[PDB]
Design a protein around this ligand. Structure first.
Ligand SMILES: [K+]
Ligand SMILES: [K+]
Ligand SMILES: [Mg+2]
Ligand SMILES: [Mg+2]
Ligand SMILES: [Mg+2]
Ligand SMILES: [Mg+2]
Ligand SMILES: [Mg+2]
Ligand SMILES: [Mg+2]
Ligand SMILES: [Mg+2]
Ligand SMILES: [Mg+2]
Ligand SMILES: [Mg+2]
Ligand SMILES: [Mg+2]
Ligand SMILES: [Mg+2]
Ligand SMILES: [Mg+2]
Lengths: 120, 233, 252, 49, 67
RNA sequence: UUUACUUAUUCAAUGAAGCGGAGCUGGAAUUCAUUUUCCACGUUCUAGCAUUCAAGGUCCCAUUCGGGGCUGAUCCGGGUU
RNA sequence: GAUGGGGAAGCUCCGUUUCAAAGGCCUGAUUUUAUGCAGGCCACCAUCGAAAGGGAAUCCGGUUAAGAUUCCGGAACCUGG
């Protein structure tokens, strides 16, 4: 009744905020990885320009998921092909898919990587 | 001592920005706080009709302590006591063909508004305690008059919470004694005398006196100023 | 049959004031303990032009009496107020041009500006350039001050209402002919869309009570009753009289 | 200004890169003289009573 | 019971006591929100007559409507 | 019909900061020398500065850090004005 | 243009800081855990609204059938860590 409260403003008191303790799971099965490597990398692009890039610029050209960003593309290429990635450039093609130019580091030769993965 | 110096701060107007002071008089309280305080204020700024404001007269501290000391010897059962009584009654009457009388006649305070009202109307209640803070007051405003008409001693006492502690509830709004044990009958008579002195004997007088009409601090000061000057000349 | 222009002004779509360049509302300090009991000293930092306003504003910085910080206030500059000048506001401030005083604390005949109508409304009266209020007397019992407003009206105000000593700066402004539709244009460009004005008599009947006719003419008395309704109140609303004013003002 | 050392943004004086030299000097003089005037005003008030 | 007394008393709305209570309560309701939860019936006998029971699941709301 | 009251209602403002009533002190009128009355109540040569529960004073504990209470900054009514 | 509120039979309308209990970011201690209790500092307030307003930082040379301040070569810079 006689507390000081040297301010004339009355603020909502801080009260305990209990964490949620649900009696049942909201989903009951966690969704598996929605973007794993095999759907981050949809398929290689084998146009003549892409093949020139593979042979000359040490750049693998992939069609990738429209939901995948450069980090996901880099880590998916690394996981799927055991290759270090120097850089990933991405564009959205006029047909609504995503094309990734994945320049590998100078240690690896994109032409032999392509040969190994099945397109020369 | 030679390194420290007295440097008084001039806290007058236009100097030395004011120190933090107790501003609890000027706090912008929440709406519910303001509403309950202003409802208490309005309830006495208005002229209170005599049916209400007889509840402004409560049992004093000593008489109330004595009354509750008597009433506490007649607490009703707790769930645990009732359970033990049920086992002690079944495990006796079932085996011994007793007529459910394995337990003595109980002596408990009677509570519940309808129950106590009916005991008053049947002249069974020997002492009625009426809480002075029943929020809808119509529930108990007729209780002093009912007790006066049926000749049942009544006391307006502080705390439906206290009556609830009497009857193992949060609030009870009433507490009645219809029968009291022989060892407590004398204390009941003395308490009834003291209570009747303050409530039932004064009923016919408190029924003609309006309450409220009380000014605030500042309005009272202004009335006192104009009465000191314009009236005492 | 159409909603007339003075009716359309109330919706305030294109008729709102053009307030982008304005410095802020011109107000006295909040009437606080320091001004109620003593005085508080601020300093004039800038005298600045306000868009749409004739009178210049004075940005006066006071110390915050309860928190260590500065409080800038936008006063209407009185004539003679200069930058770096100490302004004193309160019951105990001195009778000096630019000071803010309660009306009761100034002698009869004092000239004040930005006078409060009620104590604490922070300034209502004599705010336009060159205008001032004259204290014509006090009524100490039932504490009040009788004052003369710019319009010539006599008003009784609380003796606790404040005013600024002096006359609003920028006076004589209307003495210069505008000389140009362009100058009127630039004047109202920073006030509101109220210019130019088509005469109602040059309109059609659908547009205005005065519209229509094979000659331009009102057709009926232009003096319109106070009890008239919206769409009728065009012309001389509730005119007590018309014609060239001949004789003296200040009726009794 | 965040991509530059403190030297580029300040001057070695009582108000650095905030107030000019003449303004700071005027502040020094005003502070000193007004504090002296305050002392002598206090003495005048104490010796006029 | 007390509900009979409540019913008879609520019919004397221009009596001194009910006028006082009317004024105090109308001020309080006007100070509260236009619609707001009521903790308990203001007229428990009326609520019982209208089918209210003092158990979990029965809710009283107070509401203000322009006349 | 005219007057009073304030809590309904209405207007306004504020971060609801100093409201009301007493009291202390300071130039006073006089007392029945009880008590009555009024005024003020830390700031005005200067475009400086003014903030860290304010230093000081006093008291307690607990020791190497210090921590806390009161006063500084009068009391009472919790009616924000 | 939500919210708090108020209006409207109602679709919805007003209003945008307002008559709201509208707050997180700091840390002595707690480290039964860097949190809750528990020391203390700051709030008149969502959000949307500009590919010409404000705004962190990249240039040159070369390269394609069609991309380039984006690719390649070289040389920088800014932000966060
Ligand atoms: K015209
Ligand atoms: K016409
Ligand atoms: Mg891109
Ligand atoms: Mg014209
Ligand atoms: Mg025409
Ligand atoms: Mg017409
Ligand atoms: Mg006409
Ligand atoms: Mg014509
Ligand atoms: Mg319930
Ligand atoms: Mg809206
Ligand atoms: Mg935006
Ligand atoms: Mg731009
Ligand atoms: Mg091109
Ligand atoms: Mg490059």
């Amino acid at each position: 009744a006689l507390k000081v409260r040297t301010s004339a403003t009355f603020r909502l008191p801080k009260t305990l905020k209990l964490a949620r303790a649900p009696k049942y799971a909201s989903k009951a099965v966690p969704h598996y990885n929605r973007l794993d490597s095999y759907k981050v990398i949809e398929q290689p692009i084998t146009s003549e320009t892409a093949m020139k890039k593979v042979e000359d610029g040490n750049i693998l050209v992939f069609q990738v998921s429209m939901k995948a960003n450069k980090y996901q593309i880099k880590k998916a290429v690394k996981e799927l092909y055991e290759v270090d990635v120097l850089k990933v450039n991405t564009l959205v093609r006029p047909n609504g898919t995503k094309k990734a130019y994945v320049r590998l580091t100078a240690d690896y030769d994109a032409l032999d990587i392509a040969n190994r993965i099945g397109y020369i | 001592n030679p390194l420290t110096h007295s440097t008084p701060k001039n806290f007058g107007i236009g100097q030395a920005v004011q120190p933090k002071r107790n501003l609890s008089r000027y706090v912008k309280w929440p709406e519910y706080v303001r509403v309950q305080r202003q409802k208490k204020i309005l309830s006495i700024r208005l002229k209170v009709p005599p049916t209400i404001a007889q509840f402004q007269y409560t049992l004093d501290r000593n008489t109330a302590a004595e009354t509750f000391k008597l009433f506490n010897k007649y607490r009703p059962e707790t769930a645990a006591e009732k359970k033990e009584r049920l086992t002690k009654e079944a495990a006796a009457v079932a085996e011994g063909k007793s007529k459910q009388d394995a337990s003595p006649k109980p002596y408990a305070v009677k509570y519940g508004l309808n129950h106590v009202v009916a005991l008053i109307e049947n002249k069974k209640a020997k002492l009625v305690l009426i809480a002075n803070d029943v929020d809808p007051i119509e529930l108990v405003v007729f209780l002093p008059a009912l007790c006066k008409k049926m000749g049942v001693p009544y006391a307006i006492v502080k705390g439906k919470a206290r009556l609830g502690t009497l009857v193992n509830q949060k609030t009870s709004a009433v507490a009645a004694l219809t029968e009291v044990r022989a060892e407590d009958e004398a204390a009941l008579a003395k308490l009834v005398s003291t209570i009747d002195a303050n409530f039932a004997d004064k009923y016919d007088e408190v029924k003609k006196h309006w309450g409220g009409g009380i000014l605030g601090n500042k309005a009272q000061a202004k009335m006192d100023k104009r009465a000191k000057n314009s009236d005492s000349a | 049959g159409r909603v007339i222009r003075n009716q359309r002004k109330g919706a305030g779509s294109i008729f709102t004031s053009h307030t982008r360049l304005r410095q802020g509302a011109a107000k006295l300090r909040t009437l606080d303990y320091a001004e109620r009991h003593g005085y508080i000293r601020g300093i004039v930092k800038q005298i600045v032009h306000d868009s749409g306003r004739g009178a210049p504003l004075a940005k006066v910085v006071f110390r915050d009496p309860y928190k260590y910080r500065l409080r800038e206030e936008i006063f209407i500059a009185n004539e003679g107020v200069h930058t770096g000048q100490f302004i004193y506001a309160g019951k105990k401030a001195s009778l000096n041009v630019g000071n803010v005083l309660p009306l009761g604390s100034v002698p009869e005949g004092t000239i004040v500006s930005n006078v409060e109508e009620k104590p604490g409304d922070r300034g209502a009266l004599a705010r336009a350039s060159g205008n001032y209020v004259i204290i014509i007397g006090h009524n100490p019992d039932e504490n009040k001050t009788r004052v003369r407003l710019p319009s010539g009206a006599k008003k009784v105000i609380s003796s606790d209402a404040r005013g600024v000593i002096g006359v609003i700066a920028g006076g004589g402004r209307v003495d210069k002919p505008l000389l140009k539709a362009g100058r009127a244009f630039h004047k109202y460009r920073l006030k509101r869309n109220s210019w130019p004005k088509t005469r109602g008599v040059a309109m059609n009947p659908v547009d205005h009570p005065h519209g229509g006719g094979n000659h331009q003419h009102i057709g009926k008395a232009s003096t319109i009753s106070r009890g008239a309704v919206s769409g009728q109140k065009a012309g001389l609303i509730a005119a007590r009289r018309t014609g060239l004013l001949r004789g003296s003002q200040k009726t009794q | 200004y965040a991509t530059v050392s403190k030297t580029h943004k300040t001057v070695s004086r009582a108000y650095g890169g905030s107030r000019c030299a003449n303004c700071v000097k005027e502040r020094i003089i005003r502070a000193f003289l007004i504090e002296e005037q305050k002392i002598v005003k206090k003495v005048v008030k104490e010796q006029t009573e | 019971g007390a509900y009979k007394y409540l019913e008879e008393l609520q019919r004397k709305k221009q009596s001194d006591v009910l006028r006082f209570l009317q004024r105090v309560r109308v001020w309080e309701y006007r100070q509260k929100n236009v619609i707001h939860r009521a903790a308990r019936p203001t007229r428990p006998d009326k609520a019982r007559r209208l089918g209210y029971k003092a158990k979990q699941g029965f809710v009283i709301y107070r509401v203000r409507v322009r006349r």
